[PDB]
Design a protein around this ligand. Structure first.
Ligand code: CL
Ligand code: CL
Ligand code: CL
Length: 163
């Protein structure tokens, strides 16, 4: 585990992370996709061998010795707000189990269901709070990746409020 487990946020491509493993914001079919998923496919294509997994779950596939944890958040265009909230919380709980099982000291994670699976709604707080609920009991250093300047400021504020 990390000596003093922390949360940090960086505004950059998660494919350039400086952590011991990465969480892909995957689709259930293991396809290259778009956004974070397409960047992950270009950087670690070998990790997409048998990576298909249902909504609400996470499946890890190794690229060399580097773990890629494919986590499938719900697409809010298809789920109700109630059922989607439950599956989004569940995907993050499965990421925490995988990070623990892998024994890594750090993990790079995106905010699941906040891009093309958001159903056109701002889900920063919803997704980040489910990330904290799952990851708080792990001892890995967590580094959250985002691309928008206003999102970086809001995520940073939410991390600092708890310290
Ligand atoms: Cl970048
Ligand atoms: Cl998304
Ligand atoms: Cl973003």
């Amino acid at each position: 585990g990390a000596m003093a487990p922390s949360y940090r946020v960086k505004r950059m491509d998660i494919a350039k992370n400086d952590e011991e493993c990465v969480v892909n914001a995957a689709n259930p079919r293991g396809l290259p996709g778009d956004g974070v998923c397409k960047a992950v496919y270009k950087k670690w294509p070998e990790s997409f061998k048998n990576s298909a997994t249902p909504v609400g779950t996470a499946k890890t596939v190794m690229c060399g010795t580097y773990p890629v944890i494919h986590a499938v958040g719900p697409n809010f265009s298809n789920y109700t707000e109630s059922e989607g909230d439950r599956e989004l919380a569940a995907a993050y709980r499965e990421v925490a189990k995988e990070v623990t099982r892998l024994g890594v000291n750090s993990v790079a994670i995106p905010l699941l269901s906040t891009g093309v699976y958001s159903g056109g709604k701002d889900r920063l707080t919803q997704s980040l709070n489910h990330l904290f609920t799952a990851m708080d009991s792990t001892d890995a250093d967590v580094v959250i990746y985002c691309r928008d300047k206003e999102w970086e400021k809001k995520i940073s504020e939410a991390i600092q409020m708890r310290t």
